[PDB]
Amino acid sequence: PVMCLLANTTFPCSQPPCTPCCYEKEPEETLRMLEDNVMRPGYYQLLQASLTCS
Amino acid sequence: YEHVTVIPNTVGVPYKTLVNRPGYSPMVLEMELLSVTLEPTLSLDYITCEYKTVIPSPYVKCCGTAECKDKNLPDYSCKVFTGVYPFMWGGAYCFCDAENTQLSEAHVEKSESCKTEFASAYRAHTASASAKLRVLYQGNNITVTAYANGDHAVTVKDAKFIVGPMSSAWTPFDNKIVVYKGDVYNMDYPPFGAGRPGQFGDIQSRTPESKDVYANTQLVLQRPAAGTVHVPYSQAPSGFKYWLKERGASLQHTAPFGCQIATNPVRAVNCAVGNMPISIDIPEAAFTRVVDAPSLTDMSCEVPACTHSSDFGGVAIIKYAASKKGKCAVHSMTNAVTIREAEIEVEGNSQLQISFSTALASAEFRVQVCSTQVHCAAECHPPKDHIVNYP
Amino acid sequence: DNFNVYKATRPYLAHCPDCGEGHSCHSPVALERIRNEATDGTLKIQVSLQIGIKTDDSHDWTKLRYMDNHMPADAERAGLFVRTSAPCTITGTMGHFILARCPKGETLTVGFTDSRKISHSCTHPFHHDPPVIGREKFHSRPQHGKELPCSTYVQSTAATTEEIEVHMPPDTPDRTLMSQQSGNVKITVNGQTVRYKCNCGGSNEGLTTTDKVINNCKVDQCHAAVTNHKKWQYNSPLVPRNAELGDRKGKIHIPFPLANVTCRVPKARNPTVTYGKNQVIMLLYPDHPTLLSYRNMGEEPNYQEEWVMHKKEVVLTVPTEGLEVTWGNNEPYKYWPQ
Numbered sequence: 087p088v089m090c091l092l093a094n095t096t097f098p099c100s101q102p103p104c105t106p107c108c109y110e111k112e113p114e115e116t117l118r119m120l121e122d123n124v125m126r127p128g129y130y131q132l133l134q135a136s137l138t139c140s
Numbered sequence: 141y142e143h144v145t146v147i148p149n150t151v152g153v154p155y156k157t158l159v160n161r162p163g164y165s166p167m168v169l170e171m172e173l174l175s176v177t178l179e180p181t182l183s184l185d186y187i188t189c190e191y192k193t194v195i196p197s198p199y200v201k202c203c204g205t206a207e208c209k210d211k212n213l214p215d216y217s218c219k220v221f222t223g224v225y226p227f228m229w230g231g232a233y234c235f236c237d238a239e240n241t242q243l244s245e246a247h248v249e250k251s252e253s254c255k256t257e258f259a260s261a262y263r264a265h266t267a268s269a270s271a272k273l274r275v276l277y278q279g280n281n282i283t284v285t286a287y288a289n290g291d292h293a294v295t296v297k298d299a300k301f302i303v304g305p306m307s308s309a310w311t312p313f314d315n316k317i318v319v320y321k322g323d324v325y326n327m328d329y330p331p332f333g334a335g336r337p338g339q340f341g342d343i344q345s346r347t348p349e350s351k352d353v354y355a356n357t358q359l360v361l362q363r364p365a366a367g368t369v370h371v372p373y374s375q376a377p378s379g380f381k382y383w384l385k386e387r388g389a390s391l392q393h394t395a396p397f398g399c400q401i402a403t404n405p406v407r408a409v410n411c412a413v414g415n416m417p418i419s420i421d422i423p424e425a426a427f428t429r430v431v432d433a434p435s436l437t438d439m440s441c442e443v444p445a446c447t448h449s450s451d452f453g454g455v456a457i458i459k460y461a462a463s464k465k466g467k468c469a470v471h472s473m474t475n476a477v478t479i480r481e482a483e484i485e486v487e488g489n490s491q492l493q494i495s496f497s498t499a500l501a502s503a504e505f506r507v508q509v510c511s512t513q514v515h516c517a518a519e520c521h522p523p524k525d526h527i528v529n530y531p
Numbered sequence: 532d533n534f535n536v537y538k539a540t541r542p543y544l545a546h547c548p549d550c551g552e553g554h555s556c557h558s559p560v561a562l563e564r565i566r567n568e569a570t571d572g573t574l575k576i577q578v579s580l581q582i583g584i585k586t587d588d589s590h591d592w593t594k595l596r597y598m599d600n601h602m603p604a605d606a607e608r609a610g611l612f613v614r615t616s617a618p619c620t621i622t623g624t625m626g627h628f629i630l631a632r633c634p635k636g637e638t639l640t641v642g643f644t645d646s647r648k649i650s651h652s653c654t655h656p657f658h659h660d661p662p663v664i665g666r667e668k669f670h671s672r673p674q675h676g677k678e679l680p681c682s683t684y685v686q687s688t689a690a691t692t693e694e695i696e697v698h699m700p701p702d703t704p705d706r707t708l709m710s711q712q713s714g715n716v717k718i719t720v721n722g723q724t725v726r727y728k729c730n731c732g733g734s735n736e737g738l739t740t741t742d743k744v745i746n747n748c749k750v751d752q753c754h755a756a757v758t759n760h761k762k763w764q765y766n767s768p769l770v771p772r773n774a775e776l777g778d779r780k781g782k783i784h785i786p787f788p789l790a791n792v793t794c795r796v797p798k799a800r801n802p803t804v805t806y807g808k809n810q811v812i813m814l815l816y817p818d819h820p821t822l823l824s825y826r827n828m829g830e831e832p833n834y835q836e837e838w839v840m841h842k843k844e845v846v847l848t849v850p851t852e853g854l855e856v857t858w859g860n861n862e863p864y865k866y867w868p869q
């Protein structure tokens with residue numbers, strides 16, 4: 087049930103809109119997205135999903 | 141039948157008690173304390189551990205003035221240094237020569253170690269006394285575990301056991317104690333929110349994982365070195381780390397009455413202080429009538445070997461004439477000597493061998509086998525060692 | 532299992548007070564935080580470089596990555612060394628963290644050798660004197676002994692509990708971006724976002740992704756820096772904060788957390804004991820420094836302690852209450868008079 091944030095849109099932490107390969111596609115906005123979700127409890131679920139590729 | 145007796149508060153010493161119910165054959169019970177536990181009621185004040193000085197990247201403001209704001213953080217320190225000219229690998233970090241400022245920020249919190257490496261400051265209240273007693277009942281060893289309050293009744297083999305109340309309410313713990321792993325210390329620790337820098341309690345928290353942090357470590361930020369980006373500071377080193385090397389010997393080594401100290405829960409084990417009463421309500425079935433028990437006569441006692449020591453260094457051979465076959469209780473009527481065995485099997489015109497302990501050189505003692513007594517004459521000799529490892 | 536945290540992060544250059552000979556430098560092997568919380572003596576050292584990871588972000592235990600001026604470069608793991616007064620035994624290496632068993636020293640040095648044979652080191656004043664576990668000062672850990680509660684940093688690569696703060700790196704100044712074009716200043720971008728400032732009336736101050744020209748200007752009257760918003764860097768107090776973002780930060784889990792374990796301590800050989808009238812005589816033969824402690828088992832304990840170094844004979848009075856003698860890690864010997 088844990089939710090993460092991206093500018094004005096809400097999404098579940100484990101399922102980001104950037105996936106697959108969030109850092110490979112856009113390295114700047116991925117770190118910016120993670121920086122905005124640090125206080126949130128599902129941060130490490132977002133960190134795991136964003137840095138997964140192949 | 142309720143048998144009331146009192147034994148000294150000493151662990152590992154087997155004591156003998158004679159149960160003489162009128163009209164019934166005597167009964168000998170062997171009692172030995174396995175452990176005597178004094179568990180104090182604890183109230184956690186706070187815990188202490190190694191502190192962490194959280195220092196982020198300093199805000200170097202090129203061609204301008206950075207401003208410090210008051211932050212609600214433990215030992216929060218903020219300073220803005222003027223005339224700063226720092227350097228990086230490729231040269232100067234700032235364009236301006238004398239118009240740059242550096243904002244230094246630092247605060248104190250609990251280290252990652254606090255969950256593992258920590259000392260707990262407890263308040264000790266009225267202690268709960270408990271004892272583990274070994275009883276040789278009906279030719280078998282039974283274990284009785286009860287609170288030494290003189291109220292808690294434990295029934296083993298239909299026999300009701302009431303242990304205590306303890307003659308001494310003494311405990312090796314003071315009103316204020318400090319616990320670190322397996323070691324316990326009597327310490328007048330500083331109260332919660334009154335900790336001093338570089339000393340025990342420089343950082344104070346409710347529990348190892350709680351959010352509350354009290355800090356008084358004397359954090360003072362210093363001006364950074366010429367052309368260098370860093371956050372120099374003066375701080376009183378960990379009071380917990382200093383305490384770990386300067387704490388000295390714990391209560392396990394210093395406590396009086398030979399107290400052994402254990403943790404989880406914090407307790408005093410085998411403190412040789414005072415005595416404890418024992419109430420044994422022995423059921424009807426355990427007793428045998430004198431008429432129904434074998435009658436002993438024509439008794440003679442010879443002591444072929446005796447050495448007066450703490451251990452059973454005496455051997456006694458008793459010749460007898462029993463009326464019938466059965467089990468007879470063995471007890472010394474003289475308080476100076478103690479017999480090892482409590483019960484022996486009688487036949488008829490046979491002989492019995494018993495082991496005894498005494499401190500006397502000239503041992504003149506009475507031995508009661510069932511309801512008849514026999515006089516033993518013994519000339520016991522001194523042993524080799526003046527010191528023994530048993531009491 | 533396709534997750535790689537090292538692609539977002541990067542090794543960096545940070546301040547070091549002693550890079551060798553007694554002089555400060557921008558070290559690729561700069562020391563961050565040295566943790567000595569483990570009671571067993573194990574040190575958790577934090578460095579500016581990343582071990583066990585290549586420049587292409589792939590995991591390789593024999594490889595090491597350090598910041599080579601502008602871009603990160605590869606180096607050999609074998610070349611990495613940790614030392615205080617004598618060389619330390621490295622037990623674990625993963626990213627910014629090193630686990631090492633060090634002898635008694637006053638300073639801590641962590642170094643390595645790059646692809647070009649150049650040796651880089653960093654020295655910090657660190658008082659290292661690990662505490663004695665138990666009552667015996669031993670040099671080697673035995674397989675069997677008395678179990679004592681001790682702490683250590685677990686050898687496991689898995690990062691689950693402990694964490695560090697990470698953020699965007701600051702603007703990297705580079706004088707090579709600026710050139711003198713008789714008699715103007717040219718800013719050669721080279722596909723990078725450059726933040727510039729000039730003491731000339733031509734161009735002001737701003738951010739550029741294109742080549743700029745400052746008409747009637749001097750190179751000494753200008754400042755240029757390379758911006759990097761694609762990588763993460765540890766929130767280091769030895770590196771300046773990103774002037775524009777500032778409070779913007781991230782967090783990553785770190786390997787080797789502190790854990791409660793069991794330490795095996797040896798028990799010193801039983802001393803030869805001779806008994807006397809209300810007294811006990813012990814001939815102590817220690818192979819290493821052993822703590823000798825004693826107390827009376829009555830109202831007045833009168834505790835006494837001494838560290839025995841060489842062959843010593845001790846005369847101890849045994850009272851009516853009894854005397855408890857503890858010789859090192861051995862269980863206490865209890866004495867009573869006959």
Ligand SMILES: *[C@@H]1O[C@H](CO)[C@@H](O)[C@H](O)[C@H]1NC(C)=O
Pocket residue numbers: 276279280281
């Ligand atoms: C009872 O306990 C004592 C001490 O452990 C032992 O010497 C003895 O043999 C035991 N006797 C029986 C009958 O279990």
Ligand SMILES: *[C@@H]1O[C@H](CO)[C@@H](O)[C@H](O)[C@H]1NC(C)=O
Pocket residue numbers: 791792793
């Ligand atoms: C560590 O401490 C906890 C109790 O809080 C428990 O998991 C365990 O008993 C300990 N493990 C070891 C190896 O000592």
Ligand SMILES: [Os+3]
Pocket residue numbers: 270285286287
């Ligand atoms: Os109990």
Ligand SMILES: [Os+3]
Pocket residue numbers: 504505506
């Ligand atoms: Os007599």
Ligand SMILES: [Os+3]
Pocket residue numbers: 534535536537
């Ligand atoms: Os990883």
Ligand SMILES: [Os+3]
Pocket residue numbers: 365368370546547548555
């Ligand atoms: Os310095």
Ligand SMILES: [Os+3]
Pocket residue numbers: 658660
């Ligand atoms: Os020291």
Ligand SMILES: [Os+3]
Pocket residue numbers: 668669670
């Ligand atoms: Os030594």
